[PDB]
Amino acid sequence: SSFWTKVQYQRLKELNASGEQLEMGFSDALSRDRAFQGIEHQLMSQGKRHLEQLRTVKHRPALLELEEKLAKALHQQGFVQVVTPTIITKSALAKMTIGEDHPLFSQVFWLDGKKCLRPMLAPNLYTLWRELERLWDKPIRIFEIGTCYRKESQGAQHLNEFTMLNLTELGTPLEERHQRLEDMARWVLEAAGIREFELVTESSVVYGDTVDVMKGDLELASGAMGPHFLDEKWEIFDPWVGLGFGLERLLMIREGTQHVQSMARSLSYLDGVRLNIN
Amino acid sequence: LSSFWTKVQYQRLKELNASGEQLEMGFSDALSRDRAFQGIEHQLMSQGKRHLEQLRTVKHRPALLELEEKLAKALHQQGFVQVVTPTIITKSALAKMTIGEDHPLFSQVFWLDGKKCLRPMLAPNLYTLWRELERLWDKPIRIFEIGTCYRKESQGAQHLNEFTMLNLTELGTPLEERHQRLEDMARWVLEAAGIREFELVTESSVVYGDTVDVMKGDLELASGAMGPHFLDEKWEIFDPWVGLGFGLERLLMIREGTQHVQSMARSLSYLDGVRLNIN
């Protein structure tokens, strides 16, 4: 009836110990300790092995292989990729809501009294939409892949630095909005190797007719469409659809993993492998 | 040659990547001037629109993104392992780059709070990876990273708070081959970026190791160094090594011969070197 001690559970965890392995039980406190050195060793061996694949054939971790595969898949559907500032103005962050109540101000990393690290890509993409609409015929399709920051979590699994992928279409014919939302989820998720997922539609006073792509309980992405009450402040007058994916979750929810930090930007892990091993 | 572009017209033609010729030309008076302006602006805008049409119909991604992929693949080919590290670093990390209130680096940095700031360079994170990997992989160990870095101060006429760096390194380079290895790194990167002429100026500082800079005539394309280095002690590094760092936007600017370093940087007012403010 003796189970893993603290440090043992936490160590095995970083090493991506299964859920079952973690729930293992032993008779005596020493018998346990013996088999501990046993599992850790096996898991370490796997990490070294995987790291060997990175050194000799991949040459880049999953996050980057995923980004390229997703970008290419969208370039193929005629999406134009853009790269915008990670540093946005207070003024821009404010337009992300109506009224003088800007909840987002309490969860962002302020650099200045005027500047902050973007916690999302929407304000930048909103800006480009307005500019491209005057230059390009619709539908207009653009997306971006990049780091976003949020100083405070909503759960003990929300990273400070995370990678997002927002793709949008300005000019979507109204009756095609839902279908286009499905297309986007399909193009991205299939390209990531995830075929199962529901498009749980929803509609709130605020969020509006918001869409949540999910694989059971876990949400892979969040999307919305326009006319949207935020279009006024941004000067957008065309209907649209957009979807935002958190790439670390996609990596997580793909190669089934314990912690999401195993593959997020890090110094402790390399391509999902803890570094202080064997 | 009596009247030249107003401090407003000059600035506008600059944004629209007007050539240095156009920026200088003068005229008889305010008219011949204000007429040639709208005439040049119009041509520059047709240009930008045309370049954007290429982006929209065939490239599907801007120069910065295209360059990043070419450079990364070129290094994967020479056996370099690409890594991705956090943009937020500790005060300790920054300090190990020898400093405190000592060097103004602490004042050139964007602090998020009392113990963390946005990385102004990629060195500390790579320093950490060397340490970890030296225990798992046979040397020479080759790794590199392409990522955003932050500095809140201007050095030259150009200044980006957000810039993209490419730092490649080799841990375990034999002493007698360091200079050559720097040549190689300089070559693999720049040649892939489409820049053919450049020189590695090695300054054997009589005070602090050897400082290396890749120069293009008078412009600096990359900054580097080699170990043993006086900072290796704190980072627990003991092997010889070489590293080179490149600012991608600057590289792009140098190559395409453009006015602003921001026209191809992360932006909201530019897209693939083109000012959106056009028609």
Side-chain angles (χ1 to χ4, degrees), chain A residues 14 22 36 69 78 84 109 116 125 133 138 153 159 179-180 182 187 189 192-193 232 239 249 255 261 267-268 271:
Chain A
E14 315 179 302
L22 199 163
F36 170 72
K69 181 144 49 201
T84 64
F109 289 110
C116 77
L125 298 177
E133 193 275 334
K138 310 186 210 69
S153 66
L159 303 148
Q179 182 54 240
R180 188 70 63 264
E182 181 184 57
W187 293 323
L189 292 176
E232 190 58 54
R249 295 189 179 180
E255 320 162 321
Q261 67 171 181
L267 294 183
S268 304
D271 198 32

Side-chain angles (χ1 to χ4, degrees), chain A residues 108-174:
Chain A
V108 161
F109 289 110
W110 290 101
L111 314 191
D112 262 330
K114 296 154 198 166
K115 320 290 183 188
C116 77
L117 290 171
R118 65 186 185 193
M120 57 187 78
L121 297 172
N124 288 359
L125 298 177
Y126 247 127
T127 293
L128 291 175
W129 273 351
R130 207 204 70 184
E131 298 170 299
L132 298 172
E133 193 275 334
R134 317 191 329 109
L135 315 177
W136 298 344
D137 297 341
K138 310 186 210 69
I140 283 174
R141 298 185 169 179
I142 69 185
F143 71 103
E144 172 161 5
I145 288 177
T147 307
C148 279
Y149 311 75
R150 240 165 173 294
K151 90 171 187 179
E152 214 267 297
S153 66
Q154 311 182 189
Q157 284 301 300
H158 173 60
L159 303 148
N160 281 295
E161 296 184 54
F162 54 102
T163 306
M164 291 299 290
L165 161 42
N166 279 55
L167 73 162
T168 64
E169 178 178 68
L170 179 67
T172 322
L174 296 171

